[PDB]
Enzyme design. Structure first.
Site, short mmCIF file in Angstrom:
data_model
loop_
_atom_site.label_atom_id
_atom_site.label_comp_id
_atom_site.label_asym_id
_atom_site.label_seq_id
_atom_site.Cartn_x
_atom_site.Cartn_y
_atom_site.Cartn_z
CB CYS A 202 -16.85 0.94 4.73
SG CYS A 202 -15.27 1.81 4.73
CB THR A 235 -12.56 4.07 2.24
OG1 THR A 235 -11.44 4.33 1.38
CG2 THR A 235 -12.12 4.21 3.68
CG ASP A 236 -17.16 3.60 -2.67
OD1 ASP A 236 -16.39 3.81 -3.64
OD2 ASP A 236 -18.35 3.31 -2.83
CD1 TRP A 237 -11.02 5.68 -6.07
CD2 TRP A 237 -11.60 3.94 -4.78
NE1 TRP A 237 -10.11 4.68 -6.29
CE2 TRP A 237 -10.43 3.60 -5.50
CE3 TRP A 237 -12.14 3.00 -3.89
CZ2 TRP A 237 -9.80 2.36 -5.37
CZ3 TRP A 237 -11.51 1.76 -3.76
CH2 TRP A 237 -10.35 1.46 -4.49
#
Ligand code: NAG
Length: 713
Positions: A202, A235-237
């Protein structure tokens, strides 16, 4: 809902459920919670669960190869792979990436990229994807994931969803209408899911005011319920914002676990606390673990003998053949006046431009971390999707070797000095000028470009460089290496510019690939995967500076806007020249397609009938010219005019045929139910409208050779 029995995901689910029963809460929290930013040896790591022999899951970037490795291949960006229009090369790229990832002891590779799709040419990361078209990108997604996962590696379809610009990516809200969300942007993620992608990442952005990693509608209803995704959402970072809402919306994995500074640890102990305080039901966490463990079982990573993590290993083998092939076959010949190409036996060649030689970009320089520079030859954009080069073949070095072998004298002007370029080009038979444009992820500003590009002009004064060379030479060949569309009108207005080579992003095989084409060892066969306009003002989207992008253009991006607004591009989507000519004949349409909503039970990809074939379109292609060449035939469909407003043409098929002179071949376009469907918002269903569908086959989105009809009662 849940995956059907007797399928790869179904069996993975049975295994995952048995493993879950042996675990306690801490086990489960460790599986879903990243250890922290740079907390483990990989880009991302979770906590091991020894009770089920589950290792610390190792997650690594990225879409074109193993990040931070010193013994890995730098594959071409996804955009170059899509520019080949070659499903075989695209699958192989995935397989080869898979091989290197496993060989390096990484479980999860963070790619391929379906988002951004790339509605705006200035978009910093569009090059990581597969061009502007949801059908092509979808096909490419599916082929790449099949490739990666056949090796026993987890792929990660990113970024979900609507991360169409780098500027303010962590704050901006993307607010398209429902049909646009589903029919354009979500489309390629459905291909990824149907390909049994293990994971989805995401995005940083908001979607209708809700951060993507907290959006119940897109994560739970769309991805998981409507697309029937059985895998896990990471999640993206540091793209997570809450402990509880993210969990309850359908988030499965907190990556990397903290922010860059070790703060914002929203899961881990906080997730343990949220479960104990009854803010997140145990059933939700149980679902996260099932999805994560199922992906592990699906890819066979539970079996003994998976290599240990080590990015110092030389895992290249002969994988360079793929990079060579794609770098070569993804070149788009845009202009070839007077047939100056292919080069025969000229007495002298001038090579002009800093992008002709090895620079800090090719060298893995301390001045070029994450490839955050356009210095010397360019092979890819910058950011998390860039990798180290094990080597780099510069255009100059390759051109010099080939030309010297035939007695051709080569003069080099290895900077972007206009006067030096003129001096080098003066009195020579041909002059080859090298220009670039670069872009990347929005945490690096390179030469005043914050990630997205400031403009669609060549970098390093490329326009003036070409103009100076044209002042000194009648026979100019312009070679462009670029992350995306550049306005070429200044260059094209010069009568001395006889050839334009859109070389794209070739990675380590730059020079070899170009020589293959320049000397005509192979005919160029790549075709554009975005529109090159005559004006920046012809594009209908811009990088947004405010807190909201309303996506008011809806379904009409790139070539769909150009067709709808009756704008002639310089070079249209699907355009590419060859050293030969091809003609199309004998268009046939076989169809059993029936109207109405899709009716199959939801499986991965959506209702089971959506990816099933309902029609077949066939054309013959003959090489009518003088030399061997490969042709990319494209199918474009026009929906009935009674159906809700749809772009006039939509890509729904492509085939690539290599043909020697006088050779004929069959191009077959298989049409899935979804290829004749639109998304109906009210019923939340894919619907095939009744009526006559326009069938258009040709050499590009504008070069239609033959037309027919497909009739749905
Ligand atoms: C990692 O791989 C390299 C190259 O194969 C090898 O020399 C080194 O010993 C390995 N490192 C570890 C910790 O095993």
């Amino acid at each position: 809902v849940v995956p059907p029995a007797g399928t790869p995901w179904g069996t993975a689910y049975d295994k995952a459920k048995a493993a879950l029963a042996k675990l306690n809460l801490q086990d489960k929290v460790g599986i879903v919670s990243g250890v922290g930013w740079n907390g483990g040896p990989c880009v991302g790591n979770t906590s091991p669960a020894s009770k089920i022999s589950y290792p610390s899951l190792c997650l690594q970037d990225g879409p074109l190869g193993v990040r931070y490795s010193t013994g890995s291949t730098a594959f071409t960006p996804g955009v170059q792979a899509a520019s080949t229009w070659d499903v075989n090369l695209i699958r192989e790229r995935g397989q080869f990436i898979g091989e290197e990832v496993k060989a390096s002891g990484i479980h999860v590779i963070l790619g391929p990229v379906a988002g951004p799709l790339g509605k705006t040419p200035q978009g910093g990361r569009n090059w990581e994807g597969f061009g502007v078209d949801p059908y092509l990108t979808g096909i490419a997604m599916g082929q790449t994931i099949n490739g990666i996962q056949s090796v026993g590696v987890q792929a990660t379809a990113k970024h979900y969803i609507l991360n169409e610009q780098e500027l303010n990516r962590e704050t901006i809200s993307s607010n398209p209408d429902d049909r646009t969300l589903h029919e354009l942007y979500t489309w390629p993620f459905a291909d990824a899911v149907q390909a049994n992608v293990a994971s989805v990442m995401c995005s940083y952005n908001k979607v209708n005011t809700t951060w993507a990693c907290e959006d119940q509608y897109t994560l739970q209803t769309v991805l998981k319920d409507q697309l029937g995704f059985p895998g896990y959402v990471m999640t993206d970072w540091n793209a997570q914002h809450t402990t509880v809402q993210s969990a309850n919306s359908g988030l499965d994995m907190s990556m990397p676990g903290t922010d860059f500074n070790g703060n914002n640890r929203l899961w881990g102990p906080a997730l343990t606390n949220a479960v104990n305080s009854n803010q997140v039901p145990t059933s939700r966490v149980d679902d996260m673990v099932t999805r994560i463990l199922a992906a592990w079982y699906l890819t066979g990573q539970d079996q003994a003998g998976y290599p240990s993590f080590n990015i110092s290993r030389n895992v290249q083998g002969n994988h360079k053949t793929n990079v060579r092939a794609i770098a070569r076959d993804g070149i788009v010949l845009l202009k070839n006046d007077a047939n100056i190409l292919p080069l025969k036996k000229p007495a002298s060649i001038a090579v002009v431009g800093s992008a002709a030689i090895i620079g800090n970009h090719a060298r893995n320089s301390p001045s070029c971390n994450d490839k955050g520079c356009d210095d010397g030859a360019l092979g890819m954009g910058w950011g998390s999707g860039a990798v180290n080069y094990p080597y780099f073949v510069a255009p100059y070095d390759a051109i010099n070797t080939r030309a010297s072998s035939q007695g051709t004298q080569v003069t080099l002007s290895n900077t972007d000095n206009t006067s030096s370029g003129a001096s080098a080009a003066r009195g020579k038979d041909v002059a080859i000028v090298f220009i670039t444009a670069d872009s990347g992820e929005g945490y690096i500003t390179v030469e005043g470009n914050a990630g997205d590009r400031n403009n669609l002009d060549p970098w390093h004064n490329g326009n003036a460089l070409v103009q100076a060379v044209a002042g000194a030479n009648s026979n100019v060949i312009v070679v462009v290496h670029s992350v995306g569309a550049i306005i070429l009108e200044q260059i094209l207005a010069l009568p001395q510019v006889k050839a334009v080579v859109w070389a794209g992003l070739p990675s380590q095989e730059s020079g070899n690939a170009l020589v293959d084409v320049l000397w005509g060892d192979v005919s160029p066969s790549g075709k554009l995967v975005y529109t090159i306009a005559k004006s920046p003002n012809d594009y209908n989207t811009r990088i947004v500076s405010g807190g909201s992008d309303s996506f008011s253009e809806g379904l009409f991006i790139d070539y769909k806007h150009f067709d709808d607004a009756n704008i002639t591009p310089r070079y249209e989507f699907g355009y590419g020249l060859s050293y030969t000519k091809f003609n199309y004949s004998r268009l046939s349409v076989l169809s059993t397609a029936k109207s109405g909503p899709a009716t199959g039970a939801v499986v991965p990809g959506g209702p089971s009938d959506l990816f099933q074939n309902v029609a077949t379109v066939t054309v013959d292609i003959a090489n009518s010219g003088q030399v061997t060449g490969a042709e990319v035939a494209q199918l474009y469909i026009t929906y009935p005019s009674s159906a809700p407003r749809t772009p006039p043409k939509q890509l729904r098929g492509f085939a690539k045929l290599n043909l020697t002179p006088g050779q004929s071949g069959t191009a077959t376009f298989n049409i899935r139910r979804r290829d004749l469907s639109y998304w109906d918002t009210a019923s939340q269903k894919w619907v095939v409208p009744s009526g006559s569908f326009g069938i258009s086959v040709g050499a590009s989105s504008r070069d239609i050779r033959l037309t027919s009809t497909l009739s749905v009662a």
